[PDB]
Design an enzyme around this catalytic site. Structure first.
Site, PDB file in Angstrom:
ATOM      1  N   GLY A   3     -11.931  -5.195   8.330  1.00 34.93           N
ATOM      2  CA  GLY A   3     -11.661  -4.197   7.336  1.00 34.93           C
ATOM      3  C   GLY A   3     -13.058  -3.600   7.086  1.00 34.93           C
ATOM      4  N   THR A   4     -13.399  -2.512   6.357  1.00 31.82           N
ATOM      5  CA  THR A   4     -14.601  -1.978   5.785  1.00 31.82           C
ATOM      6  C   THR A   4     -15.339  -3.117   4.933  1.00 31.82           C
ATOM      7  OG1 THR A   4     -14.014  -0.981   3.740  1.00 31.82           O
ATOM      8  CG2 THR A   4     -13.677   0.243   5.750  1.00 31.82           C
TER       9      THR A   4
END
Lengths: 231, 202, 223, 181, 234, 242, 234, 202, 202
Positions: free
Chosen positions: E33-34
């Protein structure tokens, strides 16, 4: 086959899934120690953070289950916290039903009996934690009872848990007025057995007395280490 | 009922609504708790005034507090329909809330709101509303100020406030279960919800 | 695809339901023939067996009869449920169960047990025969583990069914069905000899199990 | 609503009294050699009789055997008592008369609305239970035969209608309808 | 050993080494994920996100990734979207319930425990899968600022600085230096949080913070001049 | 890049890559095993025709019932696993009768097919059944809101308004010819002959009054299943015209 | 190859952290027909390309109305669309009875989000294979929500879902600066939407039968333009 | 035949704590079943409950509240007096149709110091500087008001409670015996007992 | 506890040759006290349907509320098709009949146009039973209205509205619960029209 993935007997007559739970107790790489005094029980536990960013204040494996009962968990904390809430609720219900405080040993029996369910039910996995209840029973005095995922529970005059429990226990066997003295006694053997010097951040201590069970703060632990240095 | 609040009175004027209630919870013939607030603000635009069983009143109060909480993730009519449904359903369950409720407020569009609902779920609107003993004493007096809808625009804040306070004095004198201390809330489309506490009847 | 009832084979049929039919084919042979005004049911039958405490043809009611093929244990329980329904219908309603109704209910029970993966469907195919109350039209029905029920003029289920269902197909004419108790009985007996117990049901709840069929066997054998 | 029962040396005689006009009330045939007659509340009493008929018929079909009258009477008693457990008792009175083929002897049983069973030589319920015992007890004898019993019933019925019935007999030949009261 | 074949196809199964691999796999979902970070200040906490803009069609004001569990709690997660938003709503329910009953905002340590039990409860049975999100959350209460980070395993701790997502090793390394260098004011951390995200890294920068002094204990976003100042510092 | 078994088809809730639900698709394979059923919608009434598919000559072909009456102006033709169909027909009959009891109005067949599809949809969330229905039915009915209409209800839970539809064995051949032959001005009489003509090609055995039965929906007559005598005449007329 | 072992159900994480069984559900939308949604400040429009099972079959309904103020379109599995759409409609009507409020468009899209994310965490059930485009107009104004089966709801100015939806998305991005400024001109906004969906076509052309259009605004309750009414926009 | 608690109970907040006082006589009709009863029930170390109404329902409720508070204590630390009152309301109110319970809750906490909550039979909760309940409280309503003062010291409050309950005991025979008092303060729980020879002559 | 109240008032329905009429007073009453002077006692449910449930208001408002919800569900299931008067009548019967052993105490009337366009009026027994009637009245002063109309009817929608005006004007003269305001709803193929007229205040 299925015996490896669910808790059923293998051809050797052993539950592999339950035995693998014991090995999960050493994943945290934390070892503890509990000893009994004349009027109080003290439990020691390492607090390997180890990350700088991680706040040492919230890294505690010692839980105040009840007014008089506290327990120390060896293994992953997510399973430990789940166990705490169980014990934290069994003790209250016992007082409600039977009108007196939960004894230390009976709580281990209840938690151990609950663990037995996970070792027999195929769809319930063993919790994977080792619980060490320490308290000063009004009848039996100071007492230490240790529970394991297999469902066993045994009383100890002095016990150590973790990867290096054998090293710690051997020293106590060789060795065998206020709670501050036993705390120093427990810490000294942990240092001697493991050989690692300790500071306030690397140590957490819990004390069980006649009145209540409490966990020493960071500054309180530092005082005991200072007293040891005076030797 | 055991502990009861006697009466609530209200009237809608040109620019808003006024609602008042005495701060007393009566234990039968005993004026036990003279500190019970019975006007519940539910936002900047509405007030719920409750009479009857105080214990059930406090159960109504939380539902109103839950209502703002659940929504915050209101209108006066919005709140009334929620209450009316509860009051009706509690009746249907043969477990009524022994209360009479006046919901006073101003809609976001400026429309004035005054609706009554009782333990039986009976509901009605009127230029002036009163509960219990105030339905026979204040309501005739207030109706002289606003007898019909056409009189609403012709009634100002001061006139409506004076009529409400005057009704309380008459209500207090002839109501045995009343108290000299009362709370008064003014909701106006312009100045918002004005809420006055522990006023003295004189 | 073979090991579940809830899975369709790529070709589009449930194998597990089919496997229940082969269990029926392993069971003892059962036969049924419809006359103009009667129905005849024949069945396939050790030294030390107690023959006085045994009839493969169990009557569900005074006017209805039910033969079966396949697992005997499943049949004994399927029969019991049908018997209760027959009396329950006779209780909630006044008229006795229609023959089409009973087979529909029995098939429903078999169909119902196919609606879960934790239940073994009955490995029994029923051969229901009887007359509607106050009616003279013979009716014969067949049910299967899959739950499909059909009306047959003459049918055979179980061990040696194809060979016996071929003998009936050529000897039984739907336009020339047997019009006598002897005629249908002879066909049923002749049907069973191609590989004896015979039961005859007649209108108005007149069910009799024949004895001394050797006369028909001797007559048929000579011809 | 009168039901009568007489246990003669080789049979049991059951009698019953009949907006809607017809030209077999308060009776049900549980078995070829067993007959059941009931009296009490309309409606609540017939469903029980219908239910009993189904169960006894179900047993007969299941076993292909004729349940004995004694067993049938016991079954009725338990069901009647079991019925009253979770409701207010209902006025019902049942007479079970049957011929025991195994023992080759008739039997008559009386079951009250509370579910108590009595084996009787004779029994009655309703308006017939106030005076008729004065006649049957004086005239009834154990070795009385069927034809004699119906003279007694015809006699008995005569007193019933003075102070004021369809008749069936159960025998080794099975249930039998009678016009000679 | 990172696959654990044989003991990895089902949940609530212990491998011969004591590991539950399904949980470990859920950790790897988090790592994709970011990157999201959280900095604990002397007077509050700061949250930063590298929201990777996908298309212009998204409504900028309604496309917010730093969720607000409660008026005084800020939450940011990295990993599976369905699990992250599912956990936030459940955490949102707990915060409302605690306020409803005890009439006070839920303490951060208590809020973390409630989430930890829920997340851990999905590692007990084979009918459910562990949540695939590591959630950084924090706020301010009677005891001051708190920053917590729960893993898919259900384990959570208090942190002086937290990081997640693909840009985790770099952010954590720089985050350690910040704590070592300034062992912060709510104002200063906002600039530092922006710096770390840019170092970790088309992406946009989203920042929020909650401090006792500058927001009287409420959680608010960074907008206008303050934002630009943080970008200029970065 | 090795060849290995794939189990995206065995499970019913298991998605395959590209989002195909195979167990539903395999359910349609079961329909192709069922007897052919034809249905043509037009003015003056709808017409249904079904192959009876006598398993053996001893089977009572006069009792094979692939067409069932749901409402006095609605008829249903089924193909596939008839055992599963009985569950759907019973539900459809109850819904139509229930609607009359609740509204005193004949159920709109467009609403009826919606109710039936809600039942076949139950293998997932509306769950009541483990597997999708192995039967696809063809509803023909007339409501006084949309006129004579024909609906095809797949086990997948989706229904389509069809001018002319053929299901079961040989449906691909039947549909191809229906595309060549159907037209708006198709009168009922020629539609009945058309249905029989379609049955001629795709029915493996000889076409006869004993193995084929027709039905129609008319406002005056309602749902009626043609007697064996009439079907024999129509078959006789059909081969004369050919 | 290795994907086959870990794609059995929505409960097993792959060793790389991927949750395949729910990825396929997102891929199921590509099987559905293209639908396009776009909105201005005051108006929101839905454009859908219906498909028929055969030339003798009526075109499948693809646009639904939950109330007079908002509606939605469908793309993906028919059975899932049936469940979600009617479940959402069960929520439009529920609120009015007890509370008498219009259920806001934002709340409508989010109450459904919780429904989809449960199926991705439990065994037995499967993720929904249907994507929704919800358009409405309430006090706040125009709204356009795209719901993905993975429990991801995004506010959008315009979007396209279904087979070959990329082409329509590219056109909308290229024309975002234009159709947003089409305020108070419902007729022109639809023409932009019809043009947007046209780029997704390969062989089939627009017709009064297959094409369906919906629009809602301050002066326009949810209206569906289908049949001859769609001829002008073609 | 249910045993009703004939009581004369009193709670008074003072400068640095709260004092809970009650009689020791429980009566079945005119008979005194026990004259040394301990009507002061402990729900927590610094929270003490006193019961009015039926002795069975209140005793059951008190055990549950202690159970819930002990459950709460193990999780979020020592509860507040407000929290304990909230627990009582849930049990008292939702079971008002079945349980006849009247409660007085007095406790001490660091955040709010001493607090008193009274729960009449209706189930309502009212926070008061002081509270009096029981059959014998009806005879001292006019005495407590005239003599009660805010922020009194321990000696004055103890004397104030002694005088108040002496009169209730004197006039109400359902109340009597020894005056047992609990002083809740940061120093800790303190118990006091006053025999009739010590307070009657006041 | 008594779950059933009363509100008085009267309703009247007339089935003209083509048009239909439903009328009722606006006054809401409880034991001689006027709750309000304008409460709409007659409602429009759309689809050329006008409904009115007299008697207990909380029973009446619920019945119309559920019926209106049923209409919305009918629209969704039947492609928004209009609901026929006969279909609505049986739908309401099931609603009324669904609470037999705890029924609504409402004598409700629905007026509209049957399929062919003629006026339609259905009156429902509180336990559900309904019958098509040319004209019907229900409520307190129903007995005072029907006899007068029957003289003059047994007619356009402007001369019947005269008789209804006089009929209610006569009833208000001799009856105290008859309202101080008259509501009339007119149903024609054109649509539904609402007309209001004033009556005596006292």
């Amino acid at each position: 086959g299925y015996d490896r993935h669910i808790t059923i007997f293998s051809p050797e007559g052993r539950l592999y899934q339950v035995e693998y739970a014991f090995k999960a107790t050493n994943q945290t790489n934390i070892n503890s120690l509990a000893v009994r005094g004349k009027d109080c029980t003290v439990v020691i536990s390492q607090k390997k953070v180890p990350d700088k960013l991680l706040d040492p204040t919230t890294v505690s494996y010692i839980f105040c289950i009840s007014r008089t009962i506290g327990m120390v968990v060896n293994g992953p904390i997510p399973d430990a916290r789940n166990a705490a809430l169980r014990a934290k609720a069994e003790a209250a219900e016992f007082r409600y039903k039977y009108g007196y405080d939960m004894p230390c040993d009976v709580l281990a029996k209840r938690m151990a009996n609950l663990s037995q369910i996970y070792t027999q039910r195929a769809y319930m996995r063993p919790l994977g934690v080792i619980l060490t209840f320490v308290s000063v029973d009004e009848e039996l005095g100071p007492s230490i009872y240790k529970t394991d995922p297999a469902g066993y529970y045994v009383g100890y005059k002095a016990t150590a848990t973790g990867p290096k429990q054998q090293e710690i226990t051997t020293n106590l066997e060789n060795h065998f007025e206020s709670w501050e003295k036993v705390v120093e006694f427990a810490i000294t053997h942990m240092i001697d057995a493991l050989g690692t010097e300790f500071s306030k951040n690397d140590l957490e201590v819990g004390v069980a007395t006649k009145d209540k069970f409490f966990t020493l703060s960071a500054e309180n632990i530092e005082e005991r280490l200072v007293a040891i240095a005076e030797q | 009922p055991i502990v009861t609040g006697t009466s609530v009175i209200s009237m809608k004027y040109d620019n808003g609504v006024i609602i008042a209630a005495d701060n007393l919870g009566s234990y039968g013939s005993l004026l036990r708790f003279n500190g019970v607030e019975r006007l519940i603000p539910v936002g900047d635009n509405t007030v719920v005034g409750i009479s009857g069983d105080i214990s059930d009143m406090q159960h109504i109060e939380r539902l109103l507090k839950d209502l703002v909480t659940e929504n915050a993730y209101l209108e006066p009519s919005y709140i009334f329909e929620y209450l009316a449904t509860v009051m009706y359903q509690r009746r249907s369950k043969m477990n009524p809330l022994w209360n009479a409720i006046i919901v006073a407020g101003v809609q976001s569009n400026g429309d004035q709101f005054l609706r009554y609902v009782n333990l039986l779920g009976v509901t009605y609107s009127s230029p002036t509303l009163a509960t219990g003993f105030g339905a026979h004493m204040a309501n005739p007096l207030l109706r002289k100020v606003v007898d019909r809808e056409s009189d609403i625009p012709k009634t100002t804040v001061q006139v409506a406030e004076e009529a409400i306070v005057n009704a309380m004095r008459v209500l207090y004198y002839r109501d045995a279960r009343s108290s000299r201390n009362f709370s008064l809330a003014i909701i106006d489309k312009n100045t918002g919800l004005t809420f006055k506490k522990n006023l003295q009847v004189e | 695809y073979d090991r579940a009832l809830s899975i369709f084979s790529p070709d589009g049929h449930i194998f597990q339901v089919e496997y229940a039919l082969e269990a029926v084919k392993r069971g003892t042979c059962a036969v049924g023939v419809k006359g103009k005004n009667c129905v005849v049911l024949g069945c396939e039958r050790l030294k030390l067996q107690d023959t006085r405490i045994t009839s493969k043809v169990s009557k569900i009611d005074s006017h209805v009869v039910l033969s079966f093929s396949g697992l005997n244990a499943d049949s004994r329980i399927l029969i019991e449920k049908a018997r209760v329904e027959a009396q329950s219908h006779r209780l909630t309603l006044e008229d006795p169960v229609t023959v089409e109704y009973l087979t529909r209910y029995v098939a429903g029970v078999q169909q119902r047990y196919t609606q879960s993966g934790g239940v073994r469907p009955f490995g029994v195919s029923t051969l229901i025969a009887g007359f509607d109350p106050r009616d003279d039209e013979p009716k014969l029905y067949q049910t299967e583990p899959s739950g499909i029920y059909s009306s047959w003029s003459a049918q055979t289920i179980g061990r040696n069914s194809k060979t016996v269902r071929e003998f009936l197909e050529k000897n039984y004419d739907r336009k020339e069905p047997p019009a006598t108790v002897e005629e249908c009985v002879k066909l049923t007996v002749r049907s069973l000899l191609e590989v004896i117990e015979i039961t005859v049901v007649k209108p108005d709840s007149d069910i009799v199990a024949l004895s001394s069929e050797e006369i028909n066997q001797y007559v048929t054998q000579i011809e | 609503d009168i039901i009568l029962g007489i246990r003669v040396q080789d049979s049991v005689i059951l009698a019953s009294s009949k907006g809607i006009s017809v030209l077999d009330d308060k009776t049900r045939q549980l078995s070829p050699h067993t007959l059941m007659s009931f009296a009490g509340e309309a409606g609540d009493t017939v469903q029980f009789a219908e239910y009993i008929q189904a169960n006894i018929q179900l047993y007969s079909i299941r076993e292909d055997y004729e349940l004995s009258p004694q067993a049938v009477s016991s079954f009725v008693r338990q069901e009647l008592a079991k019925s009253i457990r979770s409701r207010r008792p209902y006025q019902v009175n049942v007479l079970i008369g049957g011929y025991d083929k195994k023992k080759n002897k008739p039997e008559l049983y009386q079951i009250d609305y509370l579910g108590t069973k009595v084996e009787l030589p004779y029994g009655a319920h309703g308006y017939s239970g106030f005076y008729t015992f004065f006649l049957l007890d004086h005239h009834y004898r154990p070795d009385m035969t069927t034809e004699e019993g119906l003279d007694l019933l015809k006699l008995c019925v005569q007193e019933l209608e003075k102070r004021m019935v369809i008749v069936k007999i159960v025998d080794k030949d099975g249930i039998r309808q009678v016009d000679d009261f | 050993t990172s696959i654990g074949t044989g003991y990895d196809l089902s949940n609530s199964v212990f491998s011969p080494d004591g590991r539950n691999f399904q949980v470990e796999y859920a950790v790897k979902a988090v790592e994709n994920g970011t990157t999201s970070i959280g900095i604990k200040c002397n007077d509050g906490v700061v949250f930063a996100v590298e929201k990777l803009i996908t298309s212009k069609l998204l409504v900028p004001q309604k496309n917010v990734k730093i969720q607000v569990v409660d008026r005084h709690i800020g939450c940011v997660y990295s990993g599976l979207i369905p699990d992250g938003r599912h956990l936030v709503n459940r955490g949102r329910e707990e915060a409302a319930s605690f306020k409803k009953l005890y009439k006070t905002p839920i303490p951060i340590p208590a809020f973390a425990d409630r989430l930890g039990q829920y997340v851990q409860a999905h590692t007990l049975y084979n009918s459910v899968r562990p949540f695939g999100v590591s959630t950084i959350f924090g706020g301010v209460d009677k005891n001051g600022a708190h920053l917590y980070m729960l893993e898919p395993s259900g384990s959570y701790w208090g942190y002086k600085g937290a990081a997640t997502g693909k840009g985790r090793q770099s952010a954590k390394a720089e985050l350690e230096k910040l704590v070592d260098h300034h062992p912060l004011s709510a104002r200063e951390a906002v600039k530092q949080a922006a710096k770390i995200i840019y170092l970790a890294h088309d992406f946009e920068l989203e920042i929020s913070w909650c401090s006792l002094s500058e927001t009287n204990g409420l959680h608010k976003f960074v907008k206008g001049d303050l934002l630009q100042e943080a970008i200029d510092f970065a | 890049m090795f060849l290995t078994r794939s189990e995206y088809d065995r499970g019913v809730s298991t998605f395959s890559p590209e989002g195909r639900l195979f167990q539903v698709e395999y359910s349609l394979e079961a329909i192709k095993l069922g007897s052919t059923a034809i249905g043509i919608a037009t003015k003056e009434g709808v017409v249904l025709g079904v192959e009876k598919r006598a398993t053996s000559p001893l089977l009572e072909s006069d009792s094979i019932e692939k067409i069932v009456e749901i409402d006095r102006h609605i008829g249903c033709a089924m193909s596939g696993l008839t055992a599963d169909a009985r569950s759907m027909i019973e539900h459809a009959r109850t819904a139509a009768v229930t609607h009359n009891l609740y509204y005193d109005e004949d159920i709109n067949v467009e609403s009826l097919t919606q109710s039936v599809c809600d039942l076949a949809l139950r293998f997932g969330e509306g769950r009541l059944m483990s597997r999708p229905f192995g039967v696809a039915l063809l509803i023909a009915g007339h409501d006084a809101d949309d006129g004579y209409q024909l609906f095809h209800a797949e086990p997948s839970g989706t229904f389509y308004r069809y001018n002319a539809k053929a299901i079961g064995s040989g449906s691909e051949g039947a549909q191809a010819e229906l595309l060549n032959e159907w037209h708006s001005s198709l009168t009922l009489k020629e539609a009945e002959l058309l249905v029989l003509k379609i049955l001629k090609q795709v029915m493996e055995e000889k076409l006869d009054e004993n193995n084929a039965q027709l039905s129609c929906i008319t406002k005056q007559d309602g749902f009626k299943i043609y007697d064996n005598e009439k079907t024999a005449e129509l078959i006789k007329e059909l081969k004369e015209k050919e | 190859m290795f994907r086959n072992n870990y794609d059995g159900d929505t409960v097993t994480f792959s060793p790389t952290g991927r949750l395949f069984q729910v990825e396929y559900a997102l891929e199921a939308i590509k099987q559905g027909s293209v639908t396009v949604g776009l909105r201005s400040n005051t108006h929101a429009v839905l454009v859908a390309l219906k498909r028929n099972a055969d030339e003798l079959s009526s075109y499948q309904k693809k646009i639904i109305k939950c109330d007079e103020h908002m509606g939605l379109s469908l793309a993906g599995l028919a059975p899932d669309a049936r469940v979600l759409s009617n479940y959402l409609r069960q929520q439009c009507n529920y609120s009015s009875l007890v509370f008498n409020r219009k259920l806001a468009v934002e709340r409508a899209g989010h109450l459904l989000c919780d429904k989809a994310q449960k199926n991705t965490q439990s065994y037995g059930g499967r993720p929904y294979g249907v994507g929704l485009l919800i358009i409405g107009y309430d006090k706040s104004g125009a709204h356009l929500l795209e719901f993905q089966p993975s429990g991801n709801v995004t506010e959008l100015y315009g979007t396209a879902i279904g087979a070959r939806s990329q082409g329509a998305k590219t056109y909308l991005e290229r024309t975002l600066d234009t159709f947003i400024k089409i305020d108070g001109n419902p007729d022109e906004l639809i023409k932009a939407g019809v043009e947007a969906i046209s780029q997704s076509l390969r062989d089939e052309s627009l017709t009064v039968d297959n094409l369906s259009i919906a629009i809602v605004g301050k002066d326009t309750p949810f209206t569906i333009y289908d049949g001859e009414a769609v001829a002008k926009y073609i | 035949g249910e045993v009703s608690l004939g009581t004369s109970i009193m709670a008074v907040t003072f400068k640095d704590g709260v004092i809970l006082g009650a009689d020791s006589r429980t009566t079945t009709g005119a008979y005194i079943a026990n004259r040394v009863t301990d009507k002061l029930t402990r729900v927590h170390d610094k929270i003490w409950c006193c019961r009015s109404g039926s002795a069975a329902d209140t005793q059951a409720i008190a055990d549950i509240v202690q159970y819930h508070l002990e459950l709460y204590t193990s999780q979020y630390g020592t509860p507040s007096t407000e929290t304990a009152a909230s627990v009582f309301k849930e049990l008292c109110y939702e079971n008002k149709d079945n349980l006849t319970a009247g409660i007085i809750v007095a406790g001490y906490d660091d955040k709010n110091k001493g607090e008193v909550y009274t729960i009449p039979l209706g189930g309502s909760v009212h926070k008061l500087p002081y509270a009096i309940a029981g059959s014998g409280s009806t005879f001292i309503y006019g005495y407590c008001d005239k003599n009660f003062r805010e922020n009194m010291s321990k000696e004055e409050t103890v004397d104030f409670i002694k005088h108040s309950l002496s009169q209730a005991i004197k006039w109400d025979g359902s109340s009597g015996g020894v005056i047992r008092m609990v002083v809740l303060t940061a120093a800790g729980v303190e118990r006091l007992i006053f025999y009739p020879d010590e307070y009657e002559q006041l | 506890f008594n779950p059933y109240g009363d509100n008085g008032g009267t309703i009247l329905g007339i089935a003209g040759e083509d048009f239909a009429v439903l009328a009722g007073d606006t006054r809401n009453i409880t034991d001689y006290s006027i709750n309000s002077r304008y409460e709409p006692k007659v409602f429009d449910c759309g689809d050329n349907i006008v409904m009115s449930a007299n008697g207990f208001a909380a029973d009446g408002d619920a019945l119309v509320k559920r019926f209106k919800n049923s209409v919305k569900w009918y629209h969704f299931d039947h492609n928004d098709k209009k609901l026929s008067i006969n279909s609505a009548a049986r739908n309401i019967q099931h609603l009324l009949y669904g609470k037999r052993f705890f029924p609504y105490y409402v004598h409700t009337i629905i007026a509209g146009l049957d399929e062919d366009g003629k006026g339609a009026v259905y009156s429902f027994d509180p336990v559900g039973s309904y019958e098509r009637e040319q004209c019907r009245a229900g409520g307190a002063a129903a007995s005072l209205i029907m006899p007068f109309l029957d003289n003059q009817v047994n007619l356009s929608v402007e001369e019947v509205i005269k008789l209804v005006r006089d009929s209610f004007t006569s009833a208000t003269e001799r009856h105290i619960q008859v309202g101080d305001g008259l509501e009339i709803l007119i149903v024609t193929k054109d649509g539904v029209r609402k007309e209001f007229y004033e009556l005596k205040r006292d």
